[PDB]
Design a protein around this ligand. Structure first.
Ligand SMILES: [Zn+2]
Ligand SMILES: [Zn+2]
Ligand SMILES: [Zn+2]
Ligand SMILES: [Zn+2]
Ligand SMILES: [Zn+2]
Ligand SMILES: [Zn+2]
Ligand SMILES: [Zn+2]
Lengths: 73, 75
């Protein structure tokens, strides 16, 4: 399934994920597409800031959902 | 003094502050402990949104007070 990741400047990048993909897993996918180390990114979905080791499904994130990306650098 | 911030993780962080600290000061403090830029923060207290240029005394926020932190997103 697909999900979208919106950045700060609005740049909308697309991901190929699986329902039971951990968050540490999503960060690695972003690293692959944008060269940003996982330890630098923080992901928020519908207000909540997701924590690695919880899965997309643990947060009811389904196909074509939008995650927002923030960074700690 | 000390106030509490409910972050984006539902967790809660402790801030050591002065009464004259402006909201821009507080946002900066959160930037260190959490990682979010001040330009992306929106701070809520007792039903009010706090403006960058007002102090903790203006809103009359006292010790052990709790501020709900919120993301500043659009589009
Ligand atoms: Zn797919
Ligand atoms: Zn698989
Ligand atoms: Zn991580
Ligand atoms: Zn959104
Ligand atoms: Zn200060
Ligand atoms: Zn600092
Ligand atoms: Zn004042």
């Amino acid at each position: 399934m697909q999900i979208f990741v919106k950045t700060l400047t609005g740049k909308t990048i697309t991901l190929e994920v699986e329902p039971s993909d951990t968050i540490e897993n999503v960060k690695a996918k972003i690293q692959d597409k944008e060269g940003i180390p996982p330890d630098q990114q923080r992901l928020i979905f519908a207000g909540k800031q997701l924590e690695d080791g919880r899965t997309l499904s643990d947060y009811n994130i389904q196909k074509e959902s939008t995650l927002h990306l923030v960074l700690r650098l």
